[PDB]
Design a protein around this motif. Structure first.
Motif, PDB file in Angstrom:
ATOM      1  N   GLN A 112      41.456 -23.797  47.557  1.00 38.84           N
ATOM      2  CA  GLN A 112      40.925 -22.656  46.814  1.00 38.84           C
ATOM      3  C   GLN A 112      39.503 -22.327  47.230  1.00 38.84           C
ATOM      4  OE1 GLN A 112      41.087 -23.362  42.657  1.00 38.84           O
ATOM      5  NE2 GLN A 112      43.320 -23.273  42.505  1.00 38.84           N
ATOM      6  N   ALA A 162      40.382 -19.158  50.738  1.00 37.37           N
ATOM      7  CA  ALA A 162      39.899 -18.066  49.907  1.00 37.37           C
ATOM      8  C   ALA A 162      39.866 -16.733  50.634  1.00 37.37           C
ATOM      9  CB  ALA A 162      38.509 -18.384  49.360  1.00 37.37           C
ATOM     10  N   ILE A 163      39.967 -16.723  51.956  1.00 37.40           N
ATOM     11  CA  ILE A 163      40.206 -15.473  52.664  1.00 37.40           C
ATOM     12  C   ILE A 163      41.693 -15.159  52.713  1.00 37.40           C
ATOM     13  CG2 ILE A 163      39.945 -14.312  54.884  1.00 37.40           C
ATOM     14  CD1 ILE A 163      37.411 -15.838  55.292  1.00 37.40           C
ATOM     15  N   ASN A 191      43.585 -13.605  49.710  1.00 32.40           N
ATOM     16  CA  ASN A 191      43.387 -12.174  49.561  1.00 32.40           C
ATOM     17  C   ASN A 191      44.330 -11.364  50.431  1.00 32.40           C
ATOM     18  OD1 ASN A 191      41.171 -12.474  47.751  1.00 32.40           O
ATOM     19  ND2 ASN A 191      39.931 -13.079  49.511  1.00 32.40           N
ATOM     20  N   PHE A 192      45.200 -12.025  51.176  1.00 31.23           N
ATOM     21  CA  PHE A 192      46.146 -11.419  52.094  1.00 31.23           C
ATOM     22  C   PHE A 192      47.558 -11.779  51.646  1.00 31.23           C
ATOM     23  CE2 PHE A 192      42.653 -11.394  55.461  1.00 31.23           C
ATOM     24  CZ  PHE A 192      42.267 -10.158  55.056  1.00 31.23           C
ATOM     25  N   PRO A 231      46.725  -6.989  53.632  1.00 29.51           N
ATOM     26  CA  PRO A 231      45.874  -7.153  52.451  1.00 29.51           C
ATOM     27  C   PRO A 231      46.599  -6.812  51.159  1.00 29.51           C
ATOM     28  CG  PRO A 231      44.716  -5.987  54.147  1.00 29.51           C
ATOM     29  CD  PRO A 231      46.137  -6.041  54.581  1.00 29.51           C
ATOM     30  N   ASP A 282      45.852  -6.923  46.574  1.00 31.04           N
ATOM     31  CA  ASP A 282      44.829  -7.011  45.541  1.00 31.04           C
ATOM     32  C   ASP A 282      44.460  -8.466  45.314  1.00 31.04           C
ATOM     33  OD1 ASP A 282      44.434  -4.287  44.964  1.00 31.04           O
ATOM     34  OD2 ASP A 282      46.114  -4.255  43.553  1.00 31.04           O
ATOM     35  N   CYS A 283      43.193  -8.710  45.026  1.00 32.37           N
ATOM     36  CA  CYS A 283      42.689 -10.072  44.975  1.00 32.37           C
ATOM     37  C   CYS A 283      42.956 -10.680  43.607  1.00 32.37           C
ATOM     38  CB  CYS A 283      41.207 -10.098  45.291  1.00 32.37           C
ATOM     39  SG  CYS A 283      40.199  -9.289  44.042  1.00 32.37           S
ATOM     40  N   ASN A 284      42.446 -11.888  43.400  1.00 36.72           N
ATOM     41  CA  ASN A 284      42.463 -12.507  42.089  1.00 36.72           C
ATOM     42  C   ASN A 284      41.088 -12.316  41.482  1.00 36.72           C
ATOM     43  OD1 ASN A 284      43.099 -13.961  39.820  1.00 36.72           O
ATOM     44  ND2 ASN A 284      43.391 -15.917  40.869  1.00 36.72           N
ATOM     45  N   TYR A 316      37.731 -15.080  39.340  1.00 33.85           N
ATOM     46  CA  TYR A 316      36.504 -15.794  39.648  1.00 33.85           C
ATOM     47  C   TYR A 316      35.366 -15.379  38.736  1.00 33.85           C
ATOM     48  CZ  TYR A 316      35.489 -11.508  42.294  1.00 33.85           C
ATOM     49  OH  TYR A 316      35.294 -10.208  42.674  1.00 33.85           O
ATOM     50  N   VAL A 317      35.471 -14.202  38.116  1.00 34.58           N
ATOM     51  CA  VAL A 317      34.376 -13.631  37.349  1.00 34.58           C
ATOM     52  C   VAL A 317      34.492 -13.971  35.873  1.00 34.58           C
ATOM     53  CG1 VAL A 317      35.381 -11.383  36.807  1.00 34.58           C
ATOM     54  CG2 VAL A 317      32.996 -11.519  37.466  1.00 34.58           C
ATOM     55  N   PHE A 318      35.535 -14.695  35.480  1.00 33.70           N
ATOM     56  CA  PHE A 318      35.771 -15.023  34.083  1.00 33.70           C
ATOM     57  C   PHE A 318      35.444 -16.481  33.805  1.00 33.70           C
ATOM     58  CE2 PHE A 318      39.193 -11.517  33.912  1.00 33.70           C
ATOM     59  CZ  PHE A 318      38.200 -10.571  33.733  1.00 33.70           C
ATOM     60  N   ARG A 321      36.493 -20.455  42.797  1.00 33.14           N
ATOM     61  CA  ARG A 321      37.739 -20.453  42.049  1.00 33.14           C
ATOM     62  C   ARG A 321      37.809 -21.742  41.248  1.00 33.14           C
ATOM     63  NH1 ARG A 321      39.602 -15.281  42.241  1.00 33.14           N
ATOM     64  NH2 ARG A 321      39.253 -14.475  44.351  1.00 33.14           N
ATOM     65  N   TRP A 345      28.801 -14.261  35.550  1.00 31.51           N
ATOM     66  CA  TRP A 345      28.834 -14.364  36.999  1.00 31.51           C
ATOM     67  C   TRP A 345      27.656 -13.615  37.591  1.00 31.51           C
ATOM     68  CZ3 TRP A 345      29.618 -10.950  41.122  1.00 31.51           C
ATOM     69  CH2 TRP A 345      29.937 -11.556  42.337  1.00 31.51           C
TER      70      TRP A 345
END
Lengths: 228, 35, 258, 267, 228, 258, 35, 35
Positions: free
Chosen positions: A87, A93-94, A97-98, A219, A221-223, A226-228, C255, D178
């Motif tokens: 992860q 982590a690149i 995203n694919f 490509p 859509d990402c996850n 990470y911002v939560f 992550r 963040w």
């Protein structure tokens, strides 16, 4: 006037349309970026840089080597780029995203123990079997490579690309049962023979880089978790 | 060229569509060199 | 293959390096930075103006300030708050009460693939309405300009000063969209994805780039202030990074394992 | 083969376990052109700032966990004098010029023995606020010398605690989650790095060029690089061995281009 | 008919669209303007003409020189083209209609005193410091130029363009605290030694022209508060 | 550099003239007169005609004159009043009472950058509706012509005489706009921004140019006079100065210090 | 040329689009000469 | 060519419209041969 018959997809905003649009505020001379060194031409310049993995011991980039003999792999993790040892790697982590990948994951090790620590390690790669291999007599038959500890202190086991399809999936969505492309497994071959007055349990630091033929596709859509 | 499939015809010019830098006066090279 | 990874450079090898094998074919070029960032995505959902608004006052805003919030979309992948550039991104876990819930924005699809520090591109803004049959318009003012906040009485109708200007006020058709491409206007050479210097606009906040933006758009309704409607109508801002260039490789976000 | 003496000006430093200079992003990061955002004649290098400025860094005990980093701001260390890193003729020229455009060349010395284990991750990290407390204030030397190694919490892994503008009493203060100046501690090897292992080397060698959002940045504000020493493997030794090995660092500014001469900076 | 698919920005009136439109009443031969002399090709033909500044004494284009010695600048004003000494100059009133500028402001003086008035004046330009310089020993270190009074009666101090960006902002919107590009400051070096029967307090008349490299960018909406 | 500014010509110098330095690069050409005036802006907001109007009678208009005001847009940057060229621009500070509030207009964006005396250009008029779903039209009559003010009974419908003519009566679509470019039609060679001569149409008003205009437009509704609606509908006139030329440099307006 | 980016194609002619003057029979020069 | 009558003009390119195979290194023949 030119008689045109416009198509059925007229006035459709499409987010990934391979075309330009009307300029609004043109003739702007931007300040030059010739002074900046190190431009990324392509994001596969960065999957090839080896980054640290993380291991369920509390997440640790190295494998401690306990001195007690037991006939099982010391660390064992599947070769699947949704596995939680990938992860926080630039391989993982690149590629998360694919949607697809193709090529060879390159697992670089580093023996961060003392200089006087002699030992040998049998890296491996099983292809996906019905059962994960455990015995040293079972990683002997898979794709192994014995790593001696000496003057140098790194081994780059290249996980091959053995697949029935030209682009493997990059995320174990459904199903791959615990068996997508098989398992890396670092067995210890001979015990680490330390001289007196040296630390027990040396630490094998693991990396994970991409091969010189590792290529990504599609490509998605990402996850955004990470911002939560 | 990017994600641009319109290979044939650019209606607006270069300095209107894009934004060119003003002057002052594949091959994946590595981002770090051991010297 | 016997290596030393303490050196910091590891030659990326193939299967033939250790074993018997061959190189695989090149798959595709979908990791190309000019190709990978060249696709639209939702940036911010701003409310559509109906009168000549007051632009949000600079931080720290105190209470009693009769300003108009949630209206301006500072066009930037970096975290914003209250239409102004921020350093942290903060959502509201339990938004009960209490003051003014500040409009924050972040480009979720950018930072998951912004494994670099500096980023320069043009910007292709598409402003999709989130209201049926909305006849709106889209302003813009560049990185470094400010909102012109007043009105002029045109035939006893308080027509605001954001109906005119030397900047693009694109007017949408009824039920249509607004799409235009904005050049790299800011005074910095590149937009810092990660910045560590200090901007001396205030008590100097570390890590806050002052001019890392393509400008700031705002949706309005082409009626004067007497025809102000009641229900607050939204709009949605999709941006695309045309002709992307990126420098100086860096980290991807953490992550968590939970 | 491994005995490299790096003479610069009047301060030559030596290393007999050299892994090699990690020249970053280019072949020669010494080569640089003058700034295009200054119409005045820039102050180039001269023979009293082309040398190896050396100061100490904190010790590395066994109590230091994995990923406990330690950050040196460049040129933030010449001005606050972190670790005794006194610039001398460079800081006395940096205070009097408004803009400063240089590329660095560092070297971190920490001599372990053959009976110790451990590994540092020395890495010139671009554009981070790791030297700043979360409340906005930059760290002082009394504050560095009490934590000694700033541990990798989840506030650094998420970037929750980077310095911010307080919104005021008008806006409801949002739950910050963040910020882009995080550290992903598992991916610090993308930066220009060498691993200071206890069995391959005593000193690492990194050479980075000038990067920045502008063709030259201000003198008193910039933190374009950050010499980041991160513990990947904790130090372990049997008892009797040399406890707490020292860590130093030696910084050399390669080709600086000062601009905007004025009197000495008084905040 | 030609099948055309019209874009998403159809039927959009844009005020600054770089294009023409349908002619309505063409084939009109206008009377010729070959007789008119002095055509403005470009509005930077007019920023270069020096126009009078204005000083908070009640706004006066000249600086009175009081005969009492005091160690501070006689006049001091920031180099910012939203400052109210530039509102009624063609340097300032053209550039406030724009968004950026680049180049050198040229401050022309004129000693309008008597012919027998000898004196020396130390013009200066500090770059933006944390504190405005006041002492003559503090404008000695900045960009100064000593102006003697003699046969000629004008000095054109050229304020340099020292900036961290290729186009400075033309309006101190937010923030520049009182310090955007620093301060011009006319110090007097030696007192004006007048012969007997001559007027005390001579007057230095200030101008403000643009340099030969002063260039403007990005039109904006103007300030219509001249008509109120 | 030692100079004499009483001469009236000062050579614009650089940093290298007094000091050690260099010339900066040329920034852009956004000060070009043909480029800077070539952008649209709001001119006047005129009410849309619904019947065959009487054009406003010449000044001084006395009371009891049953004329129709606020209807005609004399297309000119100079100050107008009551669809006729004026010398002073006057708004209404306290418009309570009292007579007929005369429609005035001024090009606010022009005079802030009209640092010259004479100005010639074409005119690109765009007439944006300020009413939802308005189906209108736009007349025009050149500098020197007059409004044709009557009707003709077409099948018991009083169709006015401003539905026809040799001048452009552009008909807008429902919810559309009207855009056309008008040539320099006036009998003067150039439009005087500032004029000091006397027009001898009346008791000679100093400073009033009689033919400094591109004409006069008027919005109407394409229905006969029986279908006259009740609520007075507006429209908004945006003009653009195509192919601008400007002579004889002059002053910019006085920015007050209060 | 002004604020005209349509470099390629003029549909209407010169005398219809513009308005040319009828006959009778960069380099920034200064607006005032000391002679 | 299939059911394609647009003989003249292909706006989008080959690799965007169709999907070409990547390389590795009428006459109705029978589907079964007696040998």
């Amino acid at each position: 006037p030119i008689p045109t018959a416009p198509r059925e997809n007229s006035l459709m905003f499409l987010s990934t349309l391979p075309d330009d649009t009307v300029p609004a505020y043109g003739n702007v001379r931007t300040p030059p970026v010739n002074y900046l060194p190190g431009e990324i031409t392509d994001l596969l310049q960065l999957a090839r840089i080896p980054t640290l993995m993380a291991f369920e011991r509390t997440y640790v980039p190295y494998v401690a080597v306990p001195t007690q003999f037991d006939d099982r792999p010391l660390i064992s993790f599947p070769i699947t780029l949704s596995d939680p040892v990938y992860q926080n790697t630039l391989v993982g982590a690149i590629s998360s995203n694919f949607a697809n990948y193709r090529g060879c994951i390159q697992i670089t090790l580093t023996f961060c123990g003392p200089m006087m620590a002699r030992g040998k390690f049998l890296l491996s790669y099983s292809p996906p079997n019905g059962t994960q291999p455990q015995t040293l007599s079972e990683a002997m038959q898979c794709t192994y490579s014995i790593w001696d500890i000496g003057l140098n202190s790194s081994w780059t086991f290249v996980v091959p690309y053995i697949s029935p399809s030209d682009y493997r999936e990059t995320r174990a969505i459904t199903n791959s049962v615990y068996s997508a492309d098989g398992w890396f497994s670092l067995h210890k071959l001979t015990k680490i023979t330390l001289p007196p007055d040296c630390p027990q349990s040396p630490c094998i630091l693991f990396f994970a880089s991409a091969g010189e033929d590792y290529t990504l596709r599609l490509p998605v859509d990402c996850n955004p978790s990470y911002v939560f | 060229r990017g994600n641009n499939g319109n290979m044939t015809f650019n209606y607006y010019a270069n300095t209107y569509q894009n934004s060119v830098d003003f002057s002052t006066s594949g091959i994946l090279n590595p981002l770090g060199y051991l010297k | 293959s016997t290596d030393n990874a303490e050196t910091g450079v590891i030659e990326a090898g193939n299967t033939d390096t250790d074993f018997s094998g061959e190189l695989a074919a090149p798959g595709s070029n979908h990791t190309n930075v000019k190709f990978l960032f060249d696709r639209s995505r939702l940036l911010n959902v701003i409310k559509v103006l109906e009168k000549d608004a007051v632009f949000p006052r600079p931080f720290p805003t105190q209470e009693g300030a009769q300003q108009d919030d949630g209206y301006f979309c500072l066009l930037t992948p970096r975290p914003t708050v209250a239409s102004r550039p921020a350093t942290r991104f903060g959502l509201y876990a339990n938004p009960s009460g209490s003051g003014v819930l500040a409009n924050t924005s972040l480009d979720f699809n950018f930072y998951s693939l912004a494994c670099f520090t500096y980023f320069r591109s043009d910007l292709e803004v598409t402003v999709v309405s989130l209201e049926p049959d909305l006849e709106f318009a889209v302003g813009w003012f560049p990185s470094g300009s400010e909102y012109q906040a007043s009105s002029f009485v045109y035939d006893q109708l308080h027509v605001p000063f954001h109906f005119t200007g030397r900047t693009p006020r694109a007017f949408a058709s009824k039920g249509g969209k607004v799409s235009f491409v904005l050049p790299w206007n800011s005074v910095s050479s590149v937009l810092p994805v990660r910045w560590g210097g200090a901007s001396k606009l205030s008590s100097a906040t570390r890590g806050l780039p002052a001019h890392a933006d393509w400008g700031t758009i705002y949706a309005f309704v082409p009626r004067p202030n007497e025809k102000k409607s009641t229900a607050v109508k939204h709009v949605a801002v999709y941006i695309r990074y045309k002709n992307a260039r990126a420098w100086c490789p860096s980290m991807l976000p953490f992550r968590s394992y939970k | 083969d491994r005995v490299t003496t790096q003479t610069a000006g009047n301060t030559a430093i030596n290393t007999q376990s050299s892994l090699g200079v990690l020249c970053a992003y280019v072949e020669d990061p010494t080569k640089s052109d003058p700034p295009s955002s200054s119409t005045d004649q820039p102050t180039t290098t001269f023979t009293a700032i082309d040398r190896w400025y050396t100061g100490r860094l904190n010790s590395w005990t066994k109590a230091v966990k994995t990923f406990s980093f330690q950050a040196v701001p460049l040129p933030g260390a010449f001005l606050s004098r972190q670790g005794g890193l006194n610039g001398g003729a460079f800081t006395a020229t940096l205070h009097r010029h408004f803009l400063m455009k240089c590329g660095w060349q560092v070297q971190v010395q920490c001599n372990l023995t053959q009976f110790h284990q451990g590994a540092l991750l020395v890495a010139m990290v671009p554009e981070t606020t790791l030297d700043v407390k979360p409340d906005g204030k930059a760290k002082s030397l009394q504050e560095l010398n009490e934590e000694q190694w700033v541990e990798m919490s989840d506030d650094y892994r998420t970037g929750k605690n980077m310095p911010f503008q307080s919104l005021g009493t008008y806006y409801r203060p949002p739950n910050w989650t963040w910020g882009p100046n995080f550290i992903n501690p598992y991916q610090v090897t993308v930066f220009p790095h060498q691993i200071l292992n206890a069995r391959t080397s005593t000193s690492v060698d990194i050479n980075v060029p000038y990067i920045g959002e502008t063709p030259t940045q201000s003198s008193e504000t910039q933190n374009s690089w950050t010499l980041l020493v991160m513990v990947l493997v904790p130090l372990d030794y049997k008892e009797g061995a040399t406890t707490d090995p020292e860590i130093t660092f030696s910084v050399r500014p390669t080709s600086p281009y000062f601009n905007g001469l004025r009197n000495r900076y008084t905040a």
